[PDB]
Ligand binder design. Structure first.
Ligand code: FMN
Ligand code: FMN
Lengths: 206, 204
């Protein structure tokens, strides 16, 4: 009963800071607090940073659209696409590290979305909109920002993620912000306290 | 000849010859000529340049580090080169169609090399000052629209902000919207774009 009842989590980390990654701490902190709240988690973890994912190009896009391409590295990248999508569809809760870099998410997070946001697989075209094919999936996006000191003049990261997740049917998405982390002298602390409070409220729902 | 504007043209579409943003960039440059502007282009097909992804060693290397590795010493030398082209330009023209609700990765990648402390922007007690002086920009962004899942435009504010970071405050867009709409949507957006082009060719 307990082991079958367990929720399945998919956990993407995109930071380039490695062991010092504040978004990676906070994911672990979030996941631990879910345990603390009586949730058993079955994690599939991807350090997208270390996977050397391919950029989306003309042939990869074609192949991914349904064409038989034979080149080895493309077929290898398509195999990875179908893998990441199987992993995603199987999962119950999606957790993503998305620190803001030059006002966008980091390249490796973007590349994940480029392989996974696929027609016929995670969405099908309608007369009007596209219909999302990922079902039973909620998201929790952990996002940090240094703020005004790093030129945070807008948050394009957030609505981008809401929209690219919504494309594939991931309609419910919660955010965990650590904002203003370069503000001297209490910025980091306050950001981290704010995120921990978001974590604590957010670890509960199941 | 010394009259001539210096344009920097960034192409990041993955559709090669069929690229609509590359078409509209070219139309935008044909019109500038039509209205008596002479231009000296530096042209980048970012798509074919296979640009390095920003990673930990490279970011450090860009942030004033000493790294003797070769692949990283080359990407820093490229960064410097893309930057020196930018700060030398008078007009920046960018191909930025919407792919999976973002810019194409290749464009992004250029921004991660060029948006760089002590080079294009510098730190301050509060906000960062830009160092790219005397540079307008023009952004060609074609979009499929509703059929391709455009629920909001994150591209626009993203671009104004990242360009703002390094001091490019003046930005105008060429939107070819709704291109997937049946049965005249592509023609209507192309037209729309064309009229936007007719207007923006004039300024100088
Ligand atoms: C390459 C790079 C670009 C960044 N760009 C921004 C930015 O545009 N706006 C901002 O507020 N913070 C920016 N930051 C600061 C990070 O968003 C912040 O330090 C965050 O905590 C990093 O989380 P991580 O440790 O999980 O990478 C940037 C950091 C790096 C390394
Ligand atoms: C990989 C890929 C992703 C796309 N994603 C979107 C999208 O998320 N929203 C949208 O409205 N249109 C989308 N489109 C449609 C393009 O924005 C549109 O066809 C564009 O005009 C093509 O420009 P180009 O020919 O310069 O690539 C996408 C096209 C491709 C090839």
């Amino acid at each position: 009963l307990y082991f079958q009842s367990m929720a399945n989590v998919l956990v993407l980390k995109s930071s380039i800071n490695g062991e010092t990654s504040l978004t990676n701490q906070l994911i672990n902190e979030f996941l631990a607090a879910r345990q603390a709240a009586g949730h058993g988690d079955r994690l599939i973890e991807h350090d997208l940073s270390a996977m050397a994912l391919p950029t989306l190009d003309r042939p990869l896009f074609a192949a991914l659209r349904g064409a038989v391409d034979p080149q080895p590295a493309i077929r290898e990248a398509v195999a990875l696409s179908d893998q990441l999508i199987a992993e995603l569809k199987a999962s119950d809760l999606l957790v993503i590290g998305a620190p803001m870099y030059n006002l966008n998410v980091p390249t490796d997070l973007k590349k994940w979305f480029d392989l996974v946001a696929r027609a016929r697989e995670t969405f099908r075209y309608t007369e009007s909109w596209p219909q999302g094919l990922v079902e039973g999936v909620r998201a929790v996006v952990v996002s940090s920002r240094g703020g005004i000191h790093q030129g945070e003049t807008t948050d394009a990261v957030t609505p981008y993620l809401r929209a690219v997740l919504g494309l594939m049917g991931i309609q419910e998405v919660e955010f965990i912000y650590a904002e203003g982390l370069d503000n001297r002298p209490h910025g980091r602390d306050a950001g981290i306290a704010s995120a921990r409070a978001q974590i604590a409220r957010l670890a509960v729902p199941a």
